Amino acid sequence: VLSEGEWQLVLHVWAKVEADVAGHGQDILIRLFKSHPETLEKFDRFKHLKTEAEMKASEDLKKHGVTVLTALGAILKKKGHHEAELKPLAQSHATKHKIPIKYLEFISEAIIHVLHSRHPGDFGADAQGAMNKALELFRKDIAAKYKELGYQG
Numbered sequence: 001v002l003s004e005g006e007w008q009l010v011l012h013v014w015a016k017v018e019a020d021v022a023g024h025g026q027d028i029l030i031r032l033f034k035s036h037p038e039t040l041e042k043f044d045r046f047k048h049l050k051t052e053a054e055m056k057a058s059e060d061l062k063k064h065g066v067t068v069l070t071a072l073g074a075i076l077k078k079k080g081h082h083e084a085e086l087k088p089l090a091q092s093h094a095t096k097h098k099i100p101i102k103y104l105e106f107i108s109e110a111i112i113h114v115l116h117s118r119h120p121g122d123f124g125a126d127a128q129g130a131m132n133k134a135l136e137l138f139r140k141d142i143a144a145k146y147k148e149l150g151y152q153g
């Protein structure tokens, strides 16, 4: 369970992310797709993007980065009472999108990298530790849903 002080560190940096949801989303998806190319294969609509410049130019990719960060932000602001928000997400990503838990670890690592690039003064070690704990809780709760449905990752 994160303490209240850890949730404050998380939501203090996220309020910065929300100043520019679309640029943050771009940087995070592009990092994910470059570091782990297999994840790009899950998206029929982005499969055609071959270079980082093509990814940066894609309005559809930018739009989907806003979708992802908007849903994550809604979960974070629930501070670990996020059952209603998480359940629809785990069901679609297990049974429709077929995303293994491992890929949620990958995108977590991209999120933490981008936050540290863009917000050094609000993302020192103590915030980085709280954010890693929040994303682990996110993954742990999804993985429980996966297990129930027969997908565990």
Ligand code: HEM
Pocket: 039, 040, 042, 043, 044, 045, 067, 068, 069, 071, 072, 088, 089, 092, 093, 097, 099, 103, 104, 107
């Ligand atoms: C922070 C983690 C993630 C969040 C909050 C998230 C959220 C979302 C949301 C809100 C949607 C649209 C509604 C829905 O289909 O349920 C979506 C769709 C999708 N997500 Fe995720 N997602 C995350 C991670 C991933 C990852 C790691 C992958 C793939 C490697 C993935 C693949 C997909 C696909 C294939 C779709 C449908 C996209 C389309 O063709 O319209 N998601 N995700």
